[PDB]
């Protein structure tokens, strides 16, 4: 029916927007520490799944904390220092986050171009007569 | 845009004063010599406003 492409592309745009938002939040809070209630901030990633209802678009199942090793900085002169005087720093890779941002932007632009092309084709079908 | 001209004029006059000082230093052994003083004079321009 060519109309389900709108749903597929909308799901893709939502997934890419959420991925970009998560990457931007990680970049912003890369240097942040001591989140609310004292637990240090942990880098978060998304998971993409296929919204089969055969083949279909992409949705985001949930958000999961990365299990990369958590950095430590030796600073006894800080109330957050542990028994060994280590303050916990989140495991954020700036290069990885920037690459994720760029890839998300490119995919978002490609999907909106797909949407425009399908819109033009459907208008042509409307004006077939 | 014209603020460049005052600065370049200041630079040129500084170069001239440096030339005067170098000329004074060059003849540091000529008998019966009198040194050359130097100074910078401000020359405001009175236009219409500001």
């Amino acid at each position: 029916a060519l109309l389900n492409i709108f749903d597929i592309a909308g799901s893709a745009l939502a997934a890419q927007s959420k991925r970009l938002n998560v990457a931007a939040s990680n970049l912003a809070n890369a240097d942040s520490v001591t989140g609310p209630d004292g637990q240090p901030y942990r880098a978060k990633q998304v998971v993409f799944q296929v919204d089969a209802a055969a083949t279909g678009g992409v949705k985001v199942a949930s958000v999961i904390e990365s299990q990369a090793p958590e950095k430590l900085v030796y600073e006894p002169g800080n109330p957050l220092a542990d028994a060994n005087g280590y303050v916990k720093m989140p495991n954020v890779d700036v290069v990885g986050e920037m690459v994720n941002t760029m890839s998300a932007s490119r995919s978002y632009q490609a999907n909106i171009e797909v949407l425009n092309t399908v819109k033009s084709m459907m208008l042509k079908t409307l004006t077939l007569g | 845009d014209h603020a460049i001209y005052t600065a370049m004029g200041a630079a040129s006059q500084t170069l001239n004063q440096q030339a005067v000082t170098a000329s004074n230093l060059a003849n540091a052994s000529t008998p019966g010599f009198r040194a050359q003083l130097n100074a910078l004079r401000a020359v405001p321009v009175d236009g219409l406003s500001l």
Binding site: - | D1, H2, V45, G47, L48, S49, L50
Partner: protein, 106 residues
């Protein structure tokens, strides 16, 4: 002649915009000529006079300059941009009015 006048208001507005654009371009080109005086016209009063042979006024200087040049740069650049935008606005208004007049005869 009713059509003549109805489009004539906007046509004269566009013509005066073009003249002001030309004067702005002239004082941009001669921006480094010593002994030059910035020139401009009053659009509103000029348009009123034309509706009811163009006189030009000397722009008020802002800063002194020894070489006798009074044409500023930033103020006239903003004036150039504003005049270009208003010329385009007048052009599109005239085009819309003409197209609306035309499509009735279809």
């Amino acid at each position: 002649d009713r059509l003549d006048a109805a489009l004539r208001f906007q046509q004269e507005a566009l013509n005066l915009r073009a003249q002001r654009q030309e004067i702005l371009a002239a004082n941009i080109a001669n921006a480094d000529t010593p002994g030059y005086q910035a020139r401009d016209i009053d659009f509103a009063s000029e348009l009123k006079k034309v509706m009811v042979a163009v006189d030009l006024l000397y722009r008020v200087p802002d800063q002194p300059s020894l070489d006798g040049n009074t044409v500023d740069m930033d103020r006239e650049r903003t004036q150039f941009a504003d005049n270009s935008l208003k010329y385009q606005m007048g052009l599109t208004v005239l085009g819309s009015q003409l197209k609306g007049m035309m499509n009735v005869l279809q």
